[PDB]
Structures are given as C-alpha cells and as structure tokens.
C-alpha cells in the first residue's frame, strides 16, 4: 500500500481534505503539524525529516535551498500548476528563482488579533486598533496587561515588525538597530507580555483568556469564528496596522530524500484543484494562492479585506529578506534576551 507523510502548519487544512484525498487515491496519509519555521528549519538542517512534503514560509525556504535539502518540482506532474496566481508566483520567485522548488499554498500577514470589547474597555472606544501603537507603545501595553498579551514565538517576524514600527528598514542590516532600539523597546514591552507562542493564542483569543496578540491573520479569523460558533459572546477581530505589516507566503516543498514522490505529486496536484483549495480557504480563513479558486471561496472569506486585502493595503506590506551571519547572530541573541525574562 502507498503511504504519504506530510508536515504542514497547524490549523491549515479543511477537516475532510485528507480523507477525501485518501478515498479518491487509495493512499494512506500520515499528517503532522508544526507552528514554527524555526522548528521545521532545524529538522531540515539536522538530517532526514521523515516527510515527503513540508510547508515552510518562502523566506525560510530561500535560506534552505542553498543547503540542498529540497529537490526541484517536476512541473510535468503538476498540470494544474496553471491555476496559480502569476503575480504571487513572481513574488515567491524572489525566494525560489524560476519557482523551481516551491508550490505556493496560502498567504497572509502578521498583524494584531484582539478582543474588541476588552481592548475598548481598557483603552477607550478610540483604542488605536488600526496601529502598532496598540501593542508596541509601552503605555498601552501596560494597560492591556490586565487582560492578557501574547507575542508570536517568531523572532524574524517580531524583529522586522518592531524595526518597521521604529521607522527603520524592516530588514535592516545595521547590527545596532537590533542591539539598540529594537532590543530596548522589546525589553520595555517584555514585563507586560504573558507568553511567546505561535498557536496557543488562537484558543486563548476565542476563549477570552487574552485580549490582544501578535498573530497570523487567518489564525485570528479562526479564533473569531470559534467564538461565534460557541456563542460565548467573545468578539475577536484582526488588524493590518496603518504603518504596514509583514506578509508571508507558505509553500509546499519536497525534501530531497522523500520516499513516496509519486504520491506527493498526486497530493500537490490535488491541492491545485480550484474546488479543493477554495474549500480549505473556507475553513481556515486564509487566502490561497490559486487564482482559479478565488471565485469559489465563500463571500465571507473572499470579501474580508484582512484575508484578501485590496491593492492599497497590499502596497503597505513588506517581506522578509535573508540576513547575513552577523545579523542572524545579533538578532538571535537579542531574541534570547527578550524571550527568557
Ligand atoms: Cl504544534
Ligand atoms: Cl472612553
Ligand atoms: Cl499576565
């Protein structure tokens, strides 16, 4: 029997996607999840992952390509490749030249999830929910400490966001930008942050246990929808702040030592069907990269400007660049100071 090992982000697939693929193809799927680019990259660099498909962010895949940990996708086994948005392909091609290694899957932004009522109770009806001031200004965060604050456990994203907020290059190659103002601000914020974590904030926003989080858009929209279906009265929203925000593109890639490559190609082409991936978007509240699928996704997802943002909001989004070894070391050490204490 055929078996296929997949390592994807958590909360990133419809409930029935895998079961439908199994019953159509007869392949048994082993499906596991992660919430951290650093965890996946560490697996890729330490040895065999034991997976046939993994899903890094494109900015991390750029770094991973030069280690040789992926093999190029045979485009002749991906006929539905045509369905992909060419403009998104061109953006991902900045990380994966000529799109040789990566199939764009979902994309979104790193912004602010928050409890509408709690934030307005603490900072007033005019709470600056359209601005990184909400969480990155120490006076505001000290007051939101009362109802719970979480940051992503995602150092490249947090530092780029802080740097942009401070008016620096989000991808500054100036070491002092990291050790000076970025670390200073983050250390001022630190005593107000309940935890650093990239998946617990979903149920904690849904449950009312935290009131504001740095989070990924569709994760926050999932939390909003979980509160709605529980009818617990918790109102969660998501903000792409006025100063801009990081955009990311999560992409399927094939490890160089993948065991069941024919089956992996069958799954990638399954995900390229417009009806298959639109249905995923319906359940996970993320924009997919499939331009033929967009009319098939539900109106409540397609028309949400925090999921499919319009041109003027997209014009304010930035993306990660790969840093040299000095900056990587400086950023990692500063993250360590921030996250342990
Ligand atoms: Cl996990
Ligand atoms: Cl007020
Ligand atoms: Cl706390």
UniProtKB/Swiss-Prot annotation:
Family annotation (Pfam families): SBP_bac_8
Keywords: Disulfide bond, Periplasm, Signal, Transport
InterPro entries: SBP, Sperm_putr-bd
GO molecular function, one term: putrescine binding
Disulfide-bonded cysteines: 147-211
Record has Transport as a keyword: yes
Any single GO BP term: putrescine transport
Compartment list: Periplasm
Binding site for putrescine: 10, 219, 250
Activity-regulation annotation: Transport is feedback inhibited by intracellular polyamines.
Superkingdom as given in the UniProt entry: Bacteria
Keyword rRNA-binding among record annotations: no
GO cellular component, one term: ATP-binding cassette (ABC) transporter complex, substrate-binding subunit-containing
Stated family: Belongs to the bacterial solute-binding protein PotD/PotF family.
Subunit structure: The complex is composed of two ATP-binding proteins (PotG), two transmembrane proteins (PotH and PotI) and a solute-binding protein (PotF).
Job description of the protein: Part of the ABC transporter complex PotFGHI involved in putrescine uptake. Binds putrescine. Imports putrescine for maintenance of the optimal concentration of polyamines necessary for cell growth in the presence of glucose.
Name of the protein: Putrescine-binding periplasmic protein PotF
Organism annotation: Escherichia coli (strain K12)
Lineage: Bacteria, Pseudomonadati, Pseudomonadota, Gammaproteobacteria, Enterobacterales
């Amino acid at each position: 029997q055929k078996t296929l090992h997949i390592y994807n982000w958590s909360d990133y697939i419809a409930p029935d996607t895998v079961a439908n693929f199994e019953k159509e193809t007869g392949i048994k799927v082993v499906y596991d999840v992660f919430d951290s680019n650093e965890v996946l990259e560490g697996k890729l660099m330490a040895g065999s992952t034991g997976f046939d498909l993994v899903v890094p962010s494109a900015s991390f895949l750029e770094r991973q390509l030069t280690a040789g940990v992926f093999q190029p996708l045979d485009k002749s086994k991906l006929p539905e490749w045509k369905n992909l948005d060419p403009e998104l392909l061109k953006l991902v091609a900045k990380h994966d030249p000529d799109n040789k290694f990566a199939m764009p899957y979902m994309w979104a932004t790193t912004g602010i999830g928050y409890n509408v009522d709690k934030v307005k109770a603490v900072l007033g009806e005019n709470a600056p929910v359209d601005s990184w001031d909400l969480i990155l200004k120490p006076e505001n965060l000290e007051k939101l400490k009362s109802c719970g604050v979480s940051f992503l456990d995602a150092p490249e994203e947090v530092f780029a966001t802080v740097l942009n907020y401070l008016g620096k290059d989000p991808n500054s190659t100036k070491a002092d930008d990291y050790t000076g103002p970025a670390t200073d601000l983050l250390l001022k914020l630190r005593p107000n942050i309940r935890y650093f974590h990239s998946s617990q904030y979903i149920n904690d926003l849904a449950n009312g246990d935290i009131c504001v989080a740095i989070g990924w858009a569709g994760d926050v929209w999932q939390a909003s929808n979980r509160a709605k279906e529980a009818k617990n009265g918790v109102n969660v929203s998501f903000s792409i702040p006025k100063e801009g925000a990081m955009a990311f593109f999560d992409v399927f890639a094939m490890p160089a030592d993948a065991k069941n490559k024919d089956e992996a190609y069958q799954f990638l082409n399954y995900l390229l069907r417009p009806d298959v991936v639109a249905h995923i978007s319906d359940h996970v509240f993320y924009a997919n990269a499939n331009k033929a699928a967009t009319p098939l996704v539900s109106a409540e997802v397609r028309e949400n400007p925090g999921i499919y943002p319009p041109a003027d909001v997209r014009a304010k989004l930035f993306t990660l660049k790969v840093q040299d070894p000095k900056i990587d070391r400086v950023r990692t050490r500063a993250w360590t100071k921030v996250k342990s204490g």
